[PDB]
DNA sequence: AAAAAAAAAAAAAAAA
RNA sequence: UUUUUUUUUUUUUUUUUU
């Protein structure tokens, strides 16, 4: 259960804590893929639970300490999982023809920082 | 790649002309911007209550500390960062009694048993309004636990707890702001809970609200409110250009009259002969049929920015010259027809689109914190995005939890450079009166907006509400 | 939580001025001793302190 | 427990009494403090001083001069008595002596 | 332009509005806080606008 | 047609205090007569007005 | 010609109460020492203290 | 009576 | 309602085509 070097699904107690993307593309900046992070709840590890109060108190419990270093490698972990190459993935919309997409996200600059 | 630009982060000035970046550094070292000798305080609610806030003003009195002060600046006490004198000698108390509470309060209706409960405050205070010769500045109403729990929409009461005015709102805080308009007060709701909360404890012990170590917050936002509410000036901004108001319109939910009806909401931020900023309420509400159009008729938009035009002029002389219309909605091309035709030649008439909507999230390569707040990534001309929510470095954390989301200014209409646009609502972040943090999500104008059309939503019978901030936060 | 029976040997001669309850009242009591003492002085300048 | 006497004086002038009642007190069953006689040297002496006044000191004896009666490590001494007086209850816990005719 | 009218009732009226509506604006529509209003009237007021 | 009366009543619905002075009550010294003294001397009798 | 005020003081126990005061006494136009103020700290300090 | 792209209202907890 | 933020449910309108 665990994707190159960084964990997908685990467990706390008797709740299985599982990562999920949620994707959708945007033309109006760039052509680009949009991809969101959540975490869901299952009692068994395959069923889910049902109730909405109990799954959100859940993954706020979860999101307590996991921040950037850990949402990204995961994130990018899942996308590299859906990868087809070390490069990018495709997208299967025809028999001959497929929509290729980087697995490997855009890249911005900034010139400030600072230090811990 | 994509380059993003890192606009300046804004300074607010304090007394004796200095400037800081932050707030609480700022007011706990220099103080506020006027001497307002004293604050007579009255205290409406329970005797058993007015002993909590009696020991909490007395742990005011005396300075406190935060567990980590980097992150949170210490509180040096009331005395010492406002110069005022604010004791708990000479509270003018009002007291209710629990038999008088709770014959309203086990109520089968919420409407009925809100209105009640509000009126049994309500009335109480104008009698000491209009019948006591001691002055009071501001009013302080603690709250029971219980009534939070039933006094609120959708709370049901339990069955076993049931013993036994649809023209008003269910939510005990609007309606209450909402009903006092006509008398001039300024008020602020206490909860029972907010306050020494170590009494109040759950099944494992540990308090419900526990701020074991964040007292000096709540303390600083406690403090900086009671001073504003009272008639002081706890900082004022600095970099607002001379001729330019802003005005902030937001549209909210109407649910007594049938047709949601959509009442729109406004405040301005401008410069005054001299030096002194106004920031006040520009509130003649203008109401707007129809379920889902959130756009302004001709004639009511005209009405507003009339009276916006003239609550500038008659305080500075001249009319503005630059006017930043901001707006969580687009703008549709009706309203600026109307916009247009009152404004006059000399005047540049710009609308501006905040939304938040837009689901960019900016992750860092390494590191285990999120980006600077204070960046600014230019789509074009008319566009671009501005992360008001994000890490700033005095503050030692972000003020988002997870990676934030920025926040898309368009300037739908008129032109405006985009760079006085992002150098604007990064300054406008942090001129919150009602909460004391070194910078908040989103411009003042547009939740301070907001806060006036939710109160203002919640009485039918409002006529010329009052435009002071004091009377609504 | 200090008791001014636990200060040390070198205090209990001197007066002790109480910042315990007001620091603002603590620190115009060390204002007015300085001015009585004329102790050497700068014209106020807040933006030094900057 | 306290079974200390602590003999306050003035240390440049009234040396040869203060030891001569040390001794004397001593030879008398009686434990005895006193800077000259049983400080320990290279030590903290304020310290000490406080240390024992406070904690093991359960009589007081000031020699009282014209020379003690402004001398300033007595009157510091003498207020820490008076304040460890205030803590323990007792009014026979300091006993001044008068020397100078 | 309030003063010099030939009613007296109608002078009246229009002096205590004057000064009523500026009292009520600074009470509803401003920030700092008034505990007493003083009201410095002149003396060609006081002689021509009474019963 | 009292000024005074009219105003202290259509101020009442705020709630909020005043006082009404006459130009004279103040520094009368500026206020001469056609003799060269003040109308309402108050020389003698300015502690009282103070009071 | 002696015009610093020292401020003796617990360094990481009472650091906050002492940087308020010195901020504020810097400000009214007060000399003050104290080992908070001075940033980076060296061998020679120990002494200067004292003279 | 569906499509996505745009809206606000309310609740629930966490930590600042 | 000391605040702030992030979610989850809904619901809702507009534009088009049958
Ligand atoms: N370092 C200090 N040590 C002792 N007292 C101090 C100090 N600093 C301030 N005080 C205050 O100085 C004040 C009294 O010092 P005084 O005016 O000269 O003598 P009195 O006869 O008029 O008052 C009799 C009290 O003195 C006894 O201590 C007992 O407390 C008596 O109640 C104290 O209240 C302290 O708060
Ligand atoms: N390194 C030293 N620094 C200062 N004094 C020293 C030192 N070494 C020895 N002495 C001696 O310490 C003495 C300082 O005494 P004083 O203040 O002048 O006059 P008092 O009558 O008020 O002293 C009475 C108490 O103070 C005493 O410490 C004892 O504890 C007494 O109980 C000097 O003779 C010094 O030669």
Redesign the pocket.
Same mark, same amino acid.
């Given at each position: 259960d665990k994707f190159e070097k960084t964990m997908l699904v685990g467990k706390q107690k008797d709740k299985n804590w599982h990562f999920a993307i949620?994707g959708?593309?945007?033309?109006?900046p760039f052509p680009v893929l949009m991809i969101?992070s959540?975490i869901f709840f299952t009692a068994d590890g395959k069923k889910l639970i049902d109730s909405?109060?109990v799954?959100?108190?859940s993954?706020?419990?979860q999101?307590?300490?996991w921040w950037n270093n850990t949402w990204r490698t995961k994130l990018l972990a899942f996308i590299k999982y859906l990868s087809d190459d070390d490069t990018s993935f495709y997208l299967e919309m025809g028999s001959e023809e497929k929509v290729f997409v980087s697995n490997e996200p855009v890249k911005f600059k900034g010139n400030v920082s600072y230090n811990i | 790649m994509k380059e993003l630009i890192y606009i300046e982060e804004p300074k607010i000035l304090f007394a004796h002309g200095q400037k800081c970046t932050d707030a609480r550094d700022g007011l706990a070292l220099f103080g506020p911007l006027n001497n307002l000798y004293g604050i007579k305080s009255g205290v409406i609610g329970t005797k058993q209550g007015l002993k909590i806030f009696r020991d909490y003003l007395d742990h005011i009195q005396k300075p406190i500390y935060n567990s980590?002060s980097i992150?949170?600046p210490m509180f040096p006490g009331f005395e010492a960062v406002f110069d005022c004198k604010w004791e708990s000698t000479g509270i003018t108390f009002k007291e209710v009694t629990n038999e008088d509470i709770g014959k309203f309060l086990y109520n089968s209706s919420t409407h009925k048993r809100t209105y009640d409960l509000v009126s049994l405050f309500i009335d109480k205070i104008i009698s000491a309004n209009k019948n006591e010769d001691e002055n009071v500045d501001v009013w302080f109403?603690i709250?029971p636990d219980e009534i939070?729990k039933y006094?609120?929409?959708?709370?049901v009461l339990p069955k076993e707890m049931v013993q036994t005015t649809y023209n008003y %709102?269910?939510?005990?805080?609007?309606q209450?702001?909402a009903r006092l308009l006509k008398h001039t007060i300024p008020?602020?709701?206490?909860?029972?809970?907010?306050?020494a909360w170590r009494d109040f404890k759950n099944a494992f012990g540990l308090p419900i609200? %526990?701020?074991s170590? /964040?007292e000096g917050?709540?303390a600083?936002? /406690?403090s900086?409110?009671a001073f504003y509410?009272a008639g002081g000036k706890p900082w004022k901004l600095s970099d607002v250009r001379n001729g330019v108001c802003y005005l902030g319109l937001?549209?909210?939910?109407?649910?007594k009259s049938k047709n949601?009806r959509?009442a729109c909401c406004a405040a301005q931020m401008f410069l005054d002969n001299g030096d002194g900023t106004v920031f006040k309420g520009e509130v003649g509400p203008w109401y707007n049929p129809?379920?889902?159009?959130?756009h302004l008729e001709p004639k009511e938009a005209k009405a507003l920015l009339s009276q916006s035009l003239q609550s500038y002029k008659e305080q500075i002389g001249e009319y503005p010259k630059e006017v930043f219309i901001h707006?969580?909605?687009?703008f549709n091309h009706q309203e600026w027809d109307a916009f247009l035709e009152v404004t006059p030649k000399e005047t540049n008439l710009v609308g501006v689109?905040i939304?938040?909507?837009?689901?960019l999230?900016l992750y860092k390569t390494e590191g285990d914190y999120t980006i600077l707040r204070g960046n600014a990534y230019v789509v074009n001309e008319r566009s671009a995005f501005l992360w008001?929510?994000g890490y700033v470095p005095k503050?030692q954390?972000a003020?988002?939890?997870?990676v934030?989301?920025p926040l898309f200014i368009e300037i739908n209409k008129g032109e405006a450079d985009i760079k006085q646009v992002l150098k604007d609502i990064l300054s406008l972040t942090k001129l919150?009166y009602?909460?004391? /943090?070194?910078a %908040?999500?989103?411009p003042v104008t547009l939740?301070f907006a %907001?806060?006036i059309?939710?109160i203002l939503?919640a009485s039918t019978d409002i006529k010329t509400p009052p435009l002071a901030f004091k009377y609504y /936060? | 939580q200090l008791s001014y029976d636990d200060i040390n040997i070198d205090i209990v001669r001197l007066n002790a001025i109480d910042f315990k309850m007001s620091w603002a009242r603590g620190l115009k009591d060390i204002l007015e001793a300085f001015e009585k003492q004329k102790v050497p002085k700068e014209v106020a300048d807040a933006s030094k302190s900057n | 427990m306290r079974n200390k006497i602590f003999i306050s004086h003035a240390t440049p002038d009234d040396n040869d009494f203060t030891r001569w009642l040390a001794l004397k007190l001593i030879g008398l069953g009686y434990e005895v403090w006193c800077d000259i006689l049983f400080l320990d040297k290279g030590v903290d002496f304020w310290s000490n001083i406080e240390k024992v006044i406070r904690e093991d000191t359960c009589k007081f004896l000031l020699v009282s001069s014209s020379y003690s009666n402004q001398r300033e490590g007595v009157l510091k001494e003498l207020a820490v008595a008076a304040k460890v007086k205030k803590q323990l209850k007792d009014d026979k816990f300091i006993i001044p002596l008068a020397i100078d005719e």
């Open positions: 949620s959708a593309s945007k033309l109006y969101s959540h909405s109060s799954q959100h108190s993954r706020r419990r999101g307590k300490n | 980590n992150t949170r109403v709250v939070y006094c609120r929409p959708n709370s %709102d269910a939510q005990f805080h609007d209450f702001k008020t602020q709701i206490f909860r029972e809970s907010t306050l609200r %526990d701020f170590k /964040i917050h709540l600083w936002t /406690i900086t409110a509410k937001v549209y909210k939910k109407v649910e949601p959509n129809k379920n889902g159009q959130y707006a969580k909605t687009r689109t939304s938040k909507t837009k689901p999230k008001t929510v503050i954390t003020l988002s939890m997870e934030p989301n919150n009602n909460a004391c /943090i070194f %908040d999500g989103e939740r %907001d806060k059309g939710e939503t /936060i | - | -």
